[PDB]
Amino acid sequence: ANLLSTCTSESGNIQHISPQNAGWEYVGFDVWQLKAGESITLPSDERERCLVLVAGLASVKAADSFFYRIGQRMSPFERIPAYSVYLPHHTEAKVTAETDLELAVCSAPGFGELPVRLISPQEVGVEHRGKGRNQRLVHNILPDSQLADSLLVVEVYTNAGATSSWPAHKHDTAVEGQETYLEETYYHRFNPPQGFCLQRVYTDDRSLDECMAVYNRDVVKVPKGYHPVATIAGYDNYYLNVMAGPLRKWRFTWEENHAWINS
Amino acid sequence: ANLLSTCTSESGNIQHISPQNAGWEYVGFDVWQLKAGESITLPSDERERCLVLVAGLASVKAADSFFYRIGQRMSPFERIPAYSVYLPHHTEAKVTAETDLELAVCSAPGFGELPVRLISPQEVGVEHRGKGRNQRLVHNILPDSQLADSLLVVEVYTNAGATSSWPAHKHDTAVEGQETYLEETYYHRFNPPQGFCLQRVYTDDRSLDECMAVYNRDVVKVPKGYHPVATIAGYDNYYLNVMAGPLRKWRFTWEENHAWINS
Amino acid sequence: ANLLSTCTSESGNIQHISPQNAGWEYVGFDVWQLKAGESITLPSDERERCLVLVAGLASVKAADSFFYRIGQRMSPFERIPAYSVYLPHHTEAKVTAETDLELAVCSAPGFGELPVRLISPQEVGVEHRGKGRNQRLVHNILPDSQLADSLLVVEVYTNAGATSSWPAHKHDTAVEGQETYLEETYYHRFNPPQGFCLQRVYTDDRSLDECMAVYNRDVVKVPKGYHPVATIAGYDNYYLNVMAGPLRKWRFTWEENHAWINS
Amino acid sequence: ANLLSTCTSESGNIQHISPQNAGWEYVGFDVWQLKAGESITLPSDERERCLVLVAGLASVKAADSFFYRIGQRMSPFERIPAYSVYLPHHTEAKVTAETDLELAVCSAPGFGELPVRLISPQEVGVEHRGKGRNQRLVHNILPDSQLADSLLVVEVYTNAGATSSWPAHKHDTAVEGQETYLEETYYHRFNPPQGFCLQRVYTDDRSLDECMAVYNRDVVKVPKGYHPVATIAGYDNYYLNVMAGPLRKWRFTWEENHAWINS
Amino acid sequence: ANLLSTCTSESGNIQHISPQNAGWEYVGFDVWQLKAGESITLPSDERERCLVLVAGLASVKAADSFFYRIGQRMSPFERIPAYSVYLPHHTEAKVTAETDLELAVCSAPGFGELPVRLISPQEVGVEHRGKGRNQRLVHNILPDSQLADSLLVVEVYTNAGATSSWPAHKHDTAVEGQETYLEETYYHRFNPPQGFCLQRVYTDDRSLDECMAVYNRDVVKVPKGYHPVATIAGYDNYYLNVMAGPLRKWRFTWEENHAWINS
Amino acid sequence: ANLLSTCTSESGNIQHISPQNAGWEYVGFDVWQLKAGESITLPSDERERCLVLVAGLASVKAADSFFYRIGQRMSPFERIPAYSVYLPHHTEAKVTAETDLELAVCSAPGFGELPVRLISPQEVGVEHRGKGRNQRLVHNILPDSQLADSLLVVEVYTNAGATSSWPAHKHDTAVEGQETYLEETYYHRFNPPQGFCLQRVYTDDRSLDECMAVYNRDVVKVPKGYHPVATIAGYDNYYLNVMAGPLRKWRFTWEENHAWINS
Numbered sequence A, B, C, D, E, F: 001a002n003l004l005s006t007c008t009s010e011s012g013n014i015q016h017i018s019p020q021n022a023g024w025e026y027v028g029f030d031v032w033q034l035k036a037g038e039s040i041t042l043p044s045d046e047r048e049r050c051l052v053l054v055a056g057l058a059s060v061k062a063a064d065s066f067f068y069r070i071g072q073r074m075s076p077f078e079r080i081p082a083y084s085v086y087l088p089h090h091t092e093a094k095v096t097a098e099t100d101l102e103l104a105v106c107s108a109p110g111f112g113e114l115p116v117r118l119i120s121p122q123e124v125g126v127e128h129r130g131k132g133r134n135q136r137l138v139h140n141i142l143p144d145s146q147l148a149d150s151l152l153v154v155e156v157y158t159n160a161g162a163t164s165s166w167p168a169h170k171h172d173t174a175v176e177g178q179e180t181y182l183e184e185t186y187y188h189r190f191n192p193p194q195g196f197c198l199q200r201v202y203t204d205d206r207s208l209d210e211c212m213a214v215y216n217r218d219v220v221k222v223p224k225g226y227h228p229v230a231t232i233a234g235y236d237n238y239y240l241n242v243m244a245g246p247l248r249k250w251r252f253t254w255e256e257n258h259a260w261i262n263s
């Protein structure tokens, strides 16, 4: 299975993951690397979006509003929450780079009537998950406790020598009250930039079992199974995750052999 | 090519095959394993459906009707026809498990105006196909001689030591008066339950040639080519098949090397 | 990655490439091999089409018109431009084979209001590209300088011992003013007919690097990367290409190591 | 894994399996298809051999012995035991085809001082193994109860439909008093000749799990795991097996899930 | 590539890696899991050996020497050096399990005239390599500064989270004064036992790039390239390595991008 | 299959192909990239060798012979024959680089008593094979009409565009008077150096069918089948081939479909 998508270029639409090229039904994930002064226009269509400023400042025109010079961090490694913008479906938007800009466009099916809204770093829930070699900084950009039709968005910091997305969990089957089907994308970053991590996507029966050396700005698709991330000594890791499915609830099942790591 | 889809769980939506994850255009196939008292709701959308009760009893609310305790067999290995329900498109339906229930939801594009209808075991055409090591019990749940927009549904019993879907046939190309393009899914069952069969999906030129060890509740996708099933001594086999394409007619071509087995 | 699609049959719809089975978003490509007197009907839908007569004569009924015995060449190897027909979306059309007919149906998303139009061999721009072992005859059936919503269509002749689609170029990423995302299909032909060529689809990082022995009437899909064609001594090559993407402009980037071959 | 070796030609040394090309330590297997009057010379080396006359008549000169026009069956499908000649190591041999000849040369390490000997039909143990979809005819050409340094040779007849090398067994690990490491080759034949069977080689953890479609005169290598053969309606099967390892004792372990098929 | 070898059984010769099955020239690695009172005999041949008592107590008879009840640790996770016995070539040896025993037999070509010798904990060099997420305990059982014809043997302890065989190094090419060709095996163990690590074997050009999920008692073969081990939170790792080549000198090259981690 | 071996380094033993790592029985091929003043020593063993000076000057000491500063061309692309030295088995040799040196060591089993000899340009048969897109320069360094126990060595120059090892031939089966089994290695070079060619290794049944993109100093292994080389406009190609088998005679069979290209 080919779950790894390496960047296609250095500038422009460096990552383009769609339901059509991912072989799935809900999640889309795009990254644009723009120079100061450049713009993109997002269309009025049947998809809701979450614009995540990974690095740099931007101005956004949408609905009847103008949002000027949103963003703050110049690197995701500043460890301060991303500035994001929620766009409902049927919303054309123009995004202009105020500085050089690394922009994530998270997409999923849209059908509701929520308004355009800003998700500033102060609206992002911050949590420190796990203990020891399992410690991670989590920024809940768009959790299931906040409003959206489909999208669930999170960014996670895993320092070199820690394991994250671990103990192994899956969200690949609708099992009422236990688990939901949620497609998931990982957009990875490293500090220093030449680093890599090892991500493994696997099922209990191992019918799917793929390990991948993931480098800076690579995407990993998670269509099913467990999906832990093992970082490498010397290279701090960051990832931006998008999830969506038929039911917007994060319900997962832990792999039974490793569930004791939560105790 | 990955044509085999093993069950993702023991309960809930254990099989979910869609045009999007199958890499094709028409056929969808879902299996739900429900405990007595649990329900699912099927949406009003652009897909027609055939609900097939593989094992157990169910109640269905659809259109202006209530169908109570439909089904009979508690195992597909009773060798009595499944109870099924035809749902046209734009038909919301609620299915409640009266007993523990193994429910197949067969789907394809819907566009007509046929009514909701019951397909009881007495409406299922029963035929005994082949002679010797080629003998099989066939239950024509929804054949091309019965009404539906797209769906063709059949279940077949192949006793241990027989070959079925054989002599090799294909339905992967529109060839006027000879063959139709029909995507096909296989949902396999074994008695005793720990068994397997060997299914081979292959083209004449062998550009596609994949053999698979298929276990209990596994799905095989047939996007093209010949697709025979070789059963194993000691393990009786059952499969539930769904087909659909642009033209709802079962027209196939026999592999010429093995066509003499029909003589 | 499986980028090669060999013919499924000798007659009827011998090639059927869709966004759904290609794992992409825009381009569809069909070939029909029809005997004199046979017909097909193309539907009124949301796709625009370019009918390309690869070999043989046809009559077309579309919109309020009847086009009788269009075509001329009985083989693509006559090296005279194909006769083609542009069909906008929402246009049902009936195509009848006047002689035995090899018909290419090129498709992409349609949304405009252009009329049905004939593209006769006299409307096709003819150019001789390259020098020496890089020489090729190019027929611009439907270039970006002519009108269509999405479709770009070209046919190219590469004589045995020449390389084409070379120096290596890619059109797989939206990079403003430099490159566009364009899915591309290749439909290959050989003279004598038992020949083959070697086509390689690869990225700069080699995460994708697939070489393929392509035979008569085979299709190669190009979802991303560089995609040169190396012909074989004794076997002249022909290919028919279809491209489409979000922006109908042919903008590509040359692989830097081989760009000097243009000098 | 690559366990299937198809014939490289119709005449001469059509099968050549060596420890060097098999990725293992002991077993060699060669097939020679000779016309009446042709000969081959086997060298004096460190390997013992068992020359199996699969079909046709041959004369064999080795050491102080000459065997004139030995053989009987003109096809393995006569279901009568083969003639064979055991050759110790350091024994040059000349084999002359008296009729058209299909000759199997089974080889393994030699170190002893056994004499050259004929293994006529009268020295072959004939047995019927299993009941029903499991009943095969077995010819023990060179069992562990007869003399050789390393070689174990058997031929088996599996009628169309039936499963052989079943219930699944393995002989891939030295487990004192339970199992021995024995490399194994299968040389397959079909009646009628255009047939195939499905052979699956797999381990308990499925780290190796390969199913292959086996045609006439193909060889399957079994370096480890379970290795059952599933035959296809209409096509009777035959195979000639060679085994060897560090300990010349046929000790195997049954896969636990299917062991009940022996009771 | 197929670099992972999982255990073939729970008892007996659970690991058997040979130059013939590894696709290389020097290194052999065997593991024997024996019950108290069981024995094995190692042959007199052209290979030298290093018998490593991974866990448990053993007696060893070889040439004019008898070692009674050597060993100490009942688990490799006691973090105390193993007892080992060096055997020159042409030296038959009998190993008797005094307790349940996990025995590693490390082999390589032998040509010299060194005597049989005990390598007790007092002859094992103990060192701590690296700082933080990089700090491992290393036991030099048989380094290049001690006597053997070919064999180099080391065991390493990597605590959960940490990265070992890192910064990435290779020893796959004879480069005078810089690097030697050395085949390498890894025999992995976990505490608790149900754990895994992720090991990646890769070259600078990524022509080889394999990441594998390694479980308890699995073997990884390193025929060339970089080969770091990434451990997982909760699961401590241990591995026993064997190396050999034409020149018995441990000379390696660091991957240039990660060499800074040594400063 | 894995038939391509890319260089492991820029200096030293950049190519090391052995029967053990190639999965075959006879051919060994090594390349050494040495700086002026460096030396290597070839051992006294059971292999005969042909030392080919691909580029640069070398002195060779072997048995009672010393060859001082032999060689001439500083690049294979000078299109003048190489100097080579034939070494029988049991012959230790010292090779000193007099200038920077690219040295090929071709090896195969040795058993005879031929003397050490120089193969100077005057002993190399020069021939031009084929017409047009098929015309190559061939240097028969060590043909079957010259003396050696096993080795067959040739170098071929294929100008950009042209196809070589074409029409397709195979030498993979002993067929008396028609074909011999001969393993074959290709050591490729390009001018300019950043180029590539496409080489396809395939059998008549396509059970093996591998096309690879070959770059400067890469090696392709041909264990069986047809093996043509398709060059790319702008990049001239060179390759040095080594062959050996049980019978030192170059006998091949042409693929029937392309045999007409010889007329």
Ligand SMILES: [Cl-]
Residues within 6 Å of the ligand: A045, A046, A047
């Ligand atoms: Cl949309």
Ligand SMILES: [Cl-]
Residues within 6 Å of the ligand: A129, A136, A156, A164, A165, A166
């Ligand atoms: Cl996490």
Ligand SMILES: [Cl-]
Residues within 6 Å of the ligand: A175, A176, A177, A178, A179, A180, A249, A251
């Ligand atoms: Cl739920």
Ligand SMILES: [Cl-]
Residues within 6 Å of the ligand: B045, B046, B047
């Ligand atoms: Cl729908």
Ligand SMILES: [Cl-]
Residues within 6 Å of the ligand: B129, B136, B156, B164, B165, B166
């Ligand atoms: Cl059937």
Ligand SMILES: [Cl-]
Residues within 6 Å of the ligand: B175, B176, B177, B178, B179, B180, B249, B251
């Ligand atoms: Cl029809």
Ligand SMILES: [Cl-]
Residues within 6 Å of the ligand: C045, C046, C047
């Ligand atoms: Cl449409």
Ligand SMILES: [Cl-]
Residues within 6 Å of the ligand: C129, C136, C156, C164, C165, C166
């Ligand atoms: Cl071109």
Ligand SMILES: [Cl-]
Residues within 6 Å of the ligand: C175, C176, C177, C178, C179, C180, C249, C251
């Ligand atoms: Cl642009």
Ligand SMILES: [Cl-]
Residues within 6 Å of the ligand: D062, D063, D064, D065, D115, D116
């Ligand atoms: Cl005798």
Ligand SMILES: [Cl-]
Residues within 6 Å of the ligand: D069, D070, D071
């Ligand atoms: Cl007789």
Ligand SMILES: [Cl-]
Residues within 6 Å of the ligand: D129, D136, D156, D164, D165, D166
């Ligand atoms: Cl059997």
Ligand SMILES: [Cl-]
Residues within 6 Å of the ligand: D175, D176, D177, D178, D179, D180, D249, D251
């Ligand atoms: Cl035993």
Ligand SMILES: [Cl-]
Residues within 6 Å of the ligand: E062, E063, E064, E065, E115, E116
């Ligand atoms: Cl001693």
Ligand SMILES: [Cl-]
Residues within 6 Å of the ligand: E069, E070, E071
């Ligand atoms: Cl002691």
Ligand SMILES: [Cl-]
Residues within 6 Å of the ligand: E129, E136, E156, E164, E165, E166
């Ligand atoms: Cl280390």
